[PDB]
Amino acid sequence: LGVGGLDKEFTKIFRRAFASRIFPPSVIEKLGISHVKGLLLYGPPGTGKTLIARKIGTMLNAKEPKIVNGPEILSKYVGSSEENIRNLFKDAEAEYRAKGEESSLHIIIFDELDSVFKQGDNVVNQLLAKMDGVDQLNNILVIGMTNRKDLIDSALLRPGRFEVQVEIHLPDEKGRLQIFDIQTKKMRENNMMSDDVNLAELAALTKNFSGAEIEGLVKSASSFAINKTVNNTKDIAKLKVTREDFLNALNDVTPAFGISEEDLKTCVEGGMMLYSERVNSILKNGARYVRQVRESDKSRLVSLLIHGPAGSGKTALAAEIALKSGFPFIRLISPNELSGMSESAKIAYIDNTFRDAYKSPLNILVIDSLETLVDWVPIGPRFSNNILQMLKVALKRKPPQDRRLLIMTTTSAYSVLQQMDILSCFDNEIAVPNMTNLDELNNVMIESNFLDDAGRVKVINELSRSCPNFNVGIKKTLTNIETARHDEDPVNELVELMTQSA
Amino acid sequence: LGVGGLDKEFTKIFRRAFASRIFPPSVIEKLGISHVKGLLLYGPPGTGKTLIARKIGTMLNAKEPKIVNGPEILSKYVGSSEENIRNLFKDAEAEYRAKGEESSLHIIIFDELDSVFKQGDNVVNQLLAKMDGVDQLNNILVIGMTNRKDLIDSALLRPGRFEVQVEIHLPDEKGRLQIFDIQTKKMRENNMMSDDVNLAELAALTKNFSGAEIEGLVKSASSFAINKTVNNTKDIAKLKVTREDFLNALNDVTPAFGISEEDLKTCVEGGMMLYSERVNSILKNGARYVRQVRESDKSRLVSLLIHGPAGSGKTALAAEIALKSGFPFIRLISPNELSGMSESAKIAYIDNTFRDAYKSPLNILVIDSLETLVDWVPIGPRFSNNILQMLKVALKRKPPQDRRLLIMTTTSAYSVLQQMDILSCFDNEIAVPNMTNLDELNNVMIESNFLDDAGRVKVINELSRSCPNFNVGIKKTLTNIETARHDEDPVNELVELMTQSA
Ligand SMILES: Nc1ncnc2c1ncn2[C@@H]1O[C@H](COP(=O)(O)OP(=O)(O)OP(=O)(O)O)[C@@H](O)[C@H]1O
Ligand SMILES: Nc1ncnc2c1ncn2[C@@H]1O[C@H](COP(=O)(O)OP(=O)(O)OP(=O)(O)O)[C@@H](O)[C@H]1O
Ligand SMILES: Nc1ncnc2c1ncn2[C@@H]1O[C@H](COP(=O)(O)OP(=O)(O)O)[C@@H](O)[C@H]1O
Ligand SMILES: Nc1ncnc2c1ncn2[C@@H]1O[C@H](COP(=O)(O)OP(=O)(O)O)[C@@H](O)[C@H]1O
Ligand SMILES: [Mg+2]
Ligand SMILES: [Mg+2]
Question: What is the disulfide pattern of this chain (chains A, B)?
Fold first, then answer.
């Protein structure tokens, strides 16, 4: 037919809404049943809802559907907006006067149905009165479509109105291998496709692409072969695309529900040097929870707290554990995203982020500096109570239907979180200490190629009686080393910075 | 073609948006790909985004591009505003009905697209309908332009809408040489340009000029040579522009993204004298960080705190370090800039200043009198929490894309910042102490010729017995020395003032 990967939920639509339309009225009169008049489809954008609503009508040989946009009718002035509602059905009315129950099936698509409620009452009255009032047309069938099911009021969902509802899902790996077979077909039968490409590879790499994004990949890959030979010449009738084109294109289309990789990675890491055994222990703990979530049925939600002094290195460890996990979906929430929003906008940004994490089979979330998102200042104290009560719920709600996620949160002010008592949310606590031994500083000096070994010995010797007991974080230690590299005499400056920091 | 310095952007634009229009229709119908309908260009103003749109379309010999300006739609009356969106496409429809699919390309430029969202839903919806709806045209391509990309709703950026996005940067030194080649062409071939000029020099002095400001320079340098002949004369054919005429024009034109020279030099500095050995060490240690930021790869953000008593000389040291750096971009934020603004306007002025600093290769910021920007007063205490949380984030965010900057900030209220808990933001702290020795008072008098030295002994001989332990700042000392000079008995006046001031 033309739609891939929906073979299950395709069946249910036909069974309830259309199979009754195939039989002639005389056997329907024998049963005394009455045709359903509304259907509601919901799911994430770009998944092919309209494609279903169009392709089904071809099997009935029905009229090509009318299509309407909510925001248009709502943003039009009330006058033509009002009169446009009544103008719609005249065709479905007209053939009913001419032919009645022999009349051909009519269909109307009403897009963005939630836009009416997210603030059309006349439209809702008129739209119902034509299908459920006394002026009941039997010709019509209205398809509603929305991204959010929770905004539509139950007054529309009682029987006779929108009585059947279906959910559309992102395609799994068996499905993307079908969607490639649909999109590429014309390139294959004309032999414009090389034979080194193999679609069983491309279905595995496109780990989370939706249906609409796979076209962008095919179209983008094809655009290299054209540009390779332009600049009105021969070989126009001899063009081929190559597996090289199908691997360059993966850099020009970036998926939604993907990995934010210019965050983390190049931004959050300036090193990772295993100066002490305690670092190896923490990275082994972090990697164990990542596999427990992958390989267990019994725990779909885990959340961890990472805490310690300021500048001790918490955020780089939370990112390093994530990039090695390989999960399809990763995002973070940090103060850099929320700057300049009003409080009423901040709560909507947090809420929308969690609504996305319930749509992929595996997920990670990172929350950076929880004490800063709440606006804590100790002089009052002053803080936002509305934002605190949002997070306190979101950390306990479990995702639906065997989806699962791992949450990691970091803080510098454990004494304050204990005073708000929210510590009943977390399943475990990981503590990060500062540096405290001169042997650890020797490892840092070696690993960063400070200077030749004759110099490093004197620096350790000098501190060994000037300040044997110092206590300083790794973030500051790597700064003092880097400024002394540029002075006249590093050995006599680095000691003076470290004793000031001690 | 006549556009310079934008090599890499040109390939990326041509490959995706236009190459598909060059091949014959029969081969595109063979592949089955579909033409891209929208392209988004963003960057700083005056950098040739509109220029590119005209000069690309001439290679296709397409029709002259229509132009419409966002505020010219929005500020009209709604009725004629609404009608104009329907009017704009009338030509593209009419040719399509006459030619069908073989119609020539049409192109439309939509300027200040970010004006529509910062409040347009009708005009947004109608614009989408012509490119994404049932009535979608194949003849059009729509070019969008913005400066503040983050104001675009991501609903515009999904496949099929504004699918491709490109950033235009300020030119580097390899590029500014090409712009002078283009702009001077007519002057050189008519021989109206002297042989004493050297375009490879002027490209180096125009250290941060944008393309639109080099037109202003070349025009202004020509106006001197014209005016030199008027008050209109015979022998006009003798004209030449000369190297000196560019050196005079380079004072009449001043760029954005340049030094705020007169607000640093004339206001903040009023004599710098090396009265004591502590002052040599602060300037030496301050000049080290300026070459760390210039030369090191691994550190791209640095922030310093300068703190100490009132009137000690803190603001004059911050400006003296800046004016010797030679960095291209320098600015300061001080209470004089924000006086009389509303709290909702103060936050907007601070935010916009940091987003300019992220566009140049090297930058400095001075943030003066930190406890005054917050309005802190101890009787309540009262202060603004919304401004404090604006600064606490902005001091930690690293600049994008291998750019770098140095931040310096000054305070008198170290005992208060220790309560607001913001001292984790700063990498090093510099202390500026008061005067305490009569050798320091002697050095200040010698530098400023208070009076002949046979008198100058007596001031110290009396203070040495009247009150040796005087403790005063340099700001008050220079004020006392200047008011005694105009008296009848300078010796007693200065001794009295310093004894009282202590
Ligand atoms: N083994 C390590 N553990 C932690 N950090 C390391 C290690 N090796 C190098 N680093 C570096 O130390 C710095 C730690 O910075 P980071 O921002 O994570 O500190 P932080 O404690 O989170 O700061 P804040 O408390 O202000 O959030 C980074 O530049 C990181 O590359
Ligand atoms: N070595 C020096 N260091 C600092 N200032 C000096 C020095 N020599 C002369 N001056 C002069 O002393 C004055 C110091 O004034 P300035 O406004 O910098 O004080 P301040 O510490 O900023 O005062 P406030 O604490 O109110 O900001 C300036 O006019 C400056 O030119
Ligand atoms: N499962 C699928 N199989 C084939 N094509 C698909 C599929 N999903 C999306 N598409 C393609 O993307 C478009 C259909 O999705 P569309 O209806 O535009 O998204 P939405 O449902 O958000 O309106 C068509 O161009 C269609 O060919
Ligand atoms: N890269 C460039 N090469 C040559 N001239 C340029 C360039 N960029 C800008 N100019 C000059 O600046 C003038 C105005 O630029 P404009 O296209 O209006 O910039 P924008 O549209 O981004 O404001 C142009 O007419 C042109 O002569
Ligand atoms: Mg942190
Ligand atoms: Mg000052």
Answer: none
Mark the breaks in chain B: residue after which each occurs, C to N over 2.5 Å.
119, 231
- Among the partner-chain residues B15, B134, B381, the one whose CB lies closest to the CB of A379 is B381
Residues B347, B341 contacting (CB under 8 angstroms): no
Number of H helices, E strands in chain A: 25, 10
CB atoms within 10 A of CB B359: 19
Distance of alpha carbon B210 from alpha carbon B172, whole angstroms = 10
Query: Of the candidates A115, A45, A126, A108, which has an alpha carbon nearest to the alpha carbon of residue A73?
Result: A115
CB A16 within 8 A of CB A185: no
A309's tokens:
């002094």
Angle, alpha carbons A416-A417-A419 (nearest 5°):
65
Is B265 part of the contact surface with chain A (CB cutoff 8 Å)?
A: no
What per-residue string of b and e applies to B223-252 under the rule 16 or more CB within 10 Å gives b?
A: ebbeeeeeeeeeeeeeeebbeebbeebbee
Q: Which two tokens stand for residue B55?
A: 């000069």
Largest CA distance in chain B: 106
CB atoms within 10 A of CB A132: 14
Which region holds residue A406: left if phi is over 0, alpha if psi is between -120 and 50, else beta?
Answer: beta
Gap between the Cα atoms of A142 and A127, Å rounded: 10
The experimental method, as deposited, was: cryo-EM
**CA A310 centroid distance within chain:** 31
Residues B359, B320 contacting (CB under 8 angstroms): no
User: Tokens representing B4?
Assistant: 């310079």
Write down the H helix ranges in B330-473: 335-338, 343-357, 370-373, 385-394, 414-420, 438-448, 453-466
Dist CA A363 CA A356 (whole Å): 10
Measured between CA atoms, how close is B271 to chain A, in angstroms?
A: 28
Q: How large is the greatest C-alpha to C-alpha distance in chain A, in angstroms? A: 106
Q: Name the H helices within B147-210.
A: 173-183, 185-189, 199-205
- Tell me the three state secondary structure of residue B193: strand
For the CA of B178, the nearest atom of ligand 4: 3
Where does ligand 1 bind, in terms of residues with CB under 6 Å? A 269-273, 279, 310-317, 412, 474-475, 478; B 424
- Contact of A51 with A168, CB cutoff 8 Å: no
- Rounded to the nearest angstrom, the distance between the alpha carbon of A327 and the centre of ligand 5 is 23
Dihedral over alpha carbons A164, A169, A175, A180 (to 10 degrees): 100
Angle, helix B261-268 to helix B314-322, in steps of 10 degrees: 140
AA identity, residue A12: K
Beta pairing partners, B302: B406
Taking alpha carbons only, the member of B332, B262, B260, B318 closest to residue B287 is B318
Angle between the N-to-C axes of helices A490-501 and A474-484, in degrees from 0 to 180, rounded to the nearest 10: 150
Residue B71 structure tokens: 């505020």
CA of A326 to the centre of ligand 1 (A): 22
In whole angstroms, give the CA distance from residue A365 to residue A301: 11
Q: Exposure string (b/e) for B405-432, b if CB count within 10 Å is 16 or more?
A: bbbbbbbbbeebbeebbbeebbbbebeb
Q: How many residues does chain A have?
A: 502
User: Torsion-angle region of residue B308: left (phi > 0), alpha (psi -120 to 50) or beta?
Assistant: left
Asked if A341 reaches chain B (Cβ–Cβ under 8 Å), the answer is no
Q: Give the span between the Cα atoms of A111 and A259, in whole angstroms.
A: 30
Nearest to B159 by CA among A253, A361, A466: A253
* CA atoms within 13 A of residue A483's CA, in its CB half-sphere: 21
**Would you call A222 and B393 a contact, using CB atoms and an 8 Å cutoff?**
no
Radius of gyration of chain A from its Cα atoms, rounded to whole angstroms: 31
